[PDB]
Amino acid sequence: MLLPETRNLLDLMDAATRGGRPGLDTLPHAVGRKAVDKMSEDGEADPPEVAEVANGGFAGPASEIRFRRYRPLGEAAGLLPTLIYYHGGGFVIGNIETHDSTCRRLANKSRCQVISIDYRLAPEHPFPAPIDDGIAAFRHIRDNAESFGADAARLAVGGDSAGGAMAAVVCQACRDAGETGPAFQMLIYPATDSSRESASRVAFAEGYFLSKAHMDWFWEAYVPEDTDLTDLRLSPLLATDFTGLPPAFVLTAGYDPLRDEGRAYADRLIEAGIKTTYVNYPGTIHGFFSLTRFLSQGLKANDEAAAVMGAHFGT
Amino acid sequence: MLLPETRNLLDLMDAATRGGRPGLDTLPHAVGRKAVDKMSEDGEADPPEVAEVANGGFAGPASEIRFRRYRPLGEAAGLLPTLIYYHGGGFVIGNIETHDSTCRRLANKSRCQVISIDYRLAPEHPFPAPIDDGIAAFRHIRDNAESFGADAARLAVGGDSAGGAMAAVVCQACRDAGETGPAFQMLIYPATDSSRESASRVAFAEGYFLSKAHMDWFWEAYVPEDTDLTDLRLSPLLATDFTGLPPAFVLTAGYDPLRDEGRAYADRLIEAGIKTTYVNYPGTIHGFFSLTRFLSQGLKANDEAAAVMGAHFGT
Ligand SMILES: [Mg+2]
Numbered sequence: 001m002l003l004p005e006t007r008n009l010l011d012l013m014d015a016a017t018r019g020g021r022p023g024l025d026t027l028p029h030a031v032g033r034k035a036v037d038k039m040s041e042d043g044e045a046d047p048p049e050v051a052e053v054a055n056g057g058f059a060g061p062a063s064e065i066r067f068r069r070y071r072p073l074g075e076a077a078g079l080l081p082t083l084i085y086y087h088g089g090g091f092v093i094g095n096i097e098t099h100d101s102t103c104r105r106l107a108n109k110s111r112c113q114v115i116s117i118d119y120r121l122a123p124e125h126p127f128p129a130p131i132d133d134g135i136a137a138f139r140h141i142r143d144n145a146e147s148f149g150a151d152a153a154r155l156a157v158g159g160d161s162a163g164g165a166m167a168a169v170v171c172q173a174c175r176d177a178g179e180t181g182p183a184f185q186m187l188i189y190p191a192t193d194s195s196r197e198s199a200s201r202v203a204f205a206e207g208y209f210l211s212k213a214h215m216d217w218f219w220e221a222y223v224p225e226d227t228d229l230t231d232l233r234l235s236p237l238l239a240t241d242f243t244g245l246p247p248a249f250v251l252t253a254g255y256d257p258l259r260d261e262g263r264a265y266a267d268r269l270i271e272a273g274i275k276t277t278y279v280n281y282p283g284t285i286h287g288f289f290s291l292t293r294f295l296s297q298g299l300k301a302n303d304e305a306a307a308v309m310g311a312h313f314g315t
Numbered sequence: 316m317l318l319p320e321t322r323n324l325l326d327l328m329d330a331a332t333r334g335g336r337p338g339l340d341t342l343p344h345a346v347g348r349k350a351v352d353k354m355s356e357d358g359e360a361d362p363p364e365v366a367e368v369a370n371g372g373f374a375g376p377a378s379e380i381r382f383r384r385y386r387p388l389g390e391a392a393g394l395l396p397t398l399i400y401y402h403g404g405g406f407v408i409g410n411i412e413t414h415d416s417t418c419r420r421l422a423n424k425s426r427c428q429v430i431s432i433d434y435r436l437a438p439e440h441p442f443p444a445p446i447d448d449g450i451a452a453f454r455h456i457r458d459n460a461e462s463f464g465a466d467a468a469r470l471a472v473g474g475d476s477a478g479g480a481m482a483a484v485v486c487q488a489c490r491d492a493g494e495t496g497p498a499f500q501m502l503i504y505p506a507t508d509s510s511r512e513s514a515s516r517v518a519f520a521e522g523y524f525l526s527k528a529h530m531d532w533f534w535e536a537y538v539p540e541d542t543d544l545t546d547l548r549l550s551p552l553l554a555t556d557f558t559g560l561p562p563a564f565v566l567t568a569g570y571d572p573l574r575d576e577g578r579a580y581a582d583r584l585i586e587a588g589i590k591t592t593y594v595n596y597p598g599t600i601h602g603f604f605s606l607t608r609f610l611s612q613g614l615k616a617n618d619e620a621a622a623v624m625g626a627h628f629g630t
Pocket residue numbers: 041044047097100101
């Protein structure tokens with residue numbers, strides 16, 4: 001079922017395990033974060049040139065939130081359709097640098113500005129802090145669109161995994177609060193349901209996701225004991241009503257525990273009459289969107305996500 | 316229900332001919348065909364410039380098959396990724412001219428060559444002649460790719476409505492015959508099941524612009540009495556196995572009897588582990604993809620289809 005490049009990568013990760021380094025579960029979070037972040041940086045394809053990269057920050061709810069803006073090669077317009085991007089990493093790892101090459105590629109291919117967000121992470125800042133930052137970043141850029149060289153009529157949100165969940169939740173949050181939400185949502189293999197185990201979650205739980213139960217290293221850092229797991233900030237799939245949510249691109253990986261709940265999310269969007277593009281990449285794994293040094297499928301997925309967003313925004 | 320721009324079009328369609336009674340369809344051969352073909356030509360956006368346009372013909376199984384090649388602006392390479400395109404019109408109407416602006420835009424946006432095929436129509440050439448021509452056209456181009464300026468490793472098929480069915484069937488025919496098929500299939504609101512009425516088909520029991528009785532005429536022009544409706548050239552959805560079919564982009568219109576069977580086809584591809592992109596465009600009608608003088612959604616759909624194909628082919 002797995003593509004050659006996928007098998008090859010999994011063999012590599014297996015070899016690394018026999019090298020005798022302590023597992024991620026055994027390390028303090030700050031130590032593990034630093035190590036895995038370098039691996040993530042070095043697992044992206046080489047960064048393509050863009051027209052410009054800009055660093056700054058603004059006042060979030062409880063801290064500075066840093067951003068990095070990427071201007072696409074060849075685009076000379078003042079106000080660009082803009083994707084606000086939330087990196088993955090289980091709300092515990094990842095940063096602007098781990099997804100930098102990916103954001104560069106998305107900008108160039110979409111002809112859209114990308115703004116990558118450095119939101120607070122667990123365990124230091126557990127649920128709901130990261131979601132709070134994600135929401136504040138979107139509201140701040142929306143309300144100050146011109147300052148960020150953004151076309152306020154063409155403001156997307158998106159992200160991979162945890163970041164995908166963040167993007168989905170931002171859309172629901174704006175809608176439920178009665179304010180202007182994103183014009184588009186790019187959900188790359190999002191987590192959408194913390195309350196139930198889908199068939200696909202069980203298939204890779206009777207399996208090897210960092211030796212099955214080192215989800216806890218992430219989960220226990222992020223989620224307070226006694227949090228209701230039907231909370232829509234953890235489980236956006238469980239919303240009562242999907243109407244009024246923005247047009248979407250939803251991508252799943254074939255060999256991924258989150259596959260079923262990703263597809264389920266697209267199904268709910270479609271059934272509510274939302275313009276929804278759904279794609280499944282068979283024979284690849286969770287993370288492939290940014291593991292583009294090793295997985296070519298990741299670059300194809302980058303280009304497809306970018307292409308659909310750009311087409312949506314008329315670029 | 317329906318988008319505002321869709322309503323504006325229906326209003327125009329209504330506004331024309333407060334009398335007259337012109338929306339009958341008993342003679343779409345010769346003038347029946349000519350007038351409706353002219354209206355379809357006129358319903359397309361103005362043609363964008365492309366790098367080069369070429370007209371030719373080659374020997375089909377029972378006739379000359381004509382083609383128009385469109386070379387995209389900005390592409391210098393000799394051998395391009397190429398989409399072989401089959402116009403819609405129920406296998407009774409349409410031609411290269413009715414889909415000319417659409418093919419031009421597809422080429423430019425995808426950075427792929429488009430080759431539009433003029434296949435035999437019913438009632439002059441009933442089932443299975445139009446399909447045989449579609450299959451023969453792909454095989455000819457595949458086997459003589461370099462003479463068409465096509466990269467044989469990146470040869471797509473696609474079409475709208477009947478044309479979408481044709482593309483679906485070409486892929487299955489190549490697979491069933493044991494030969495190299497298309498690298499990609501672009502299915503724009505395809506007909507996929509003649510053997511059953513989906514929920515969306517049944518919803519339009521009274522008809523769809525044409526009364527059901529009038530739609531029956533088109534059916535009977537194409538399909539000889541006592542044809543088996545489970546014939547996979549009429550009903551590709553009924554294939555027992557979807558494995559080994561090429562990567563797909565499948566689009567449905569929300570307000571369209573063919574919507575449900577289009578999504579079903581994507582679902583069968585997804586479940587067989589084929590890389591499949593599905594999108595529903597809510598609130599628009601069958602034919603919107605080429606009604607781009609009146610429907611902006613058509614331009615967006617053109618762009619999405621072209622961009623996904625281009626992203627697949629690495630353009
Ligand atoms: Mg880097």
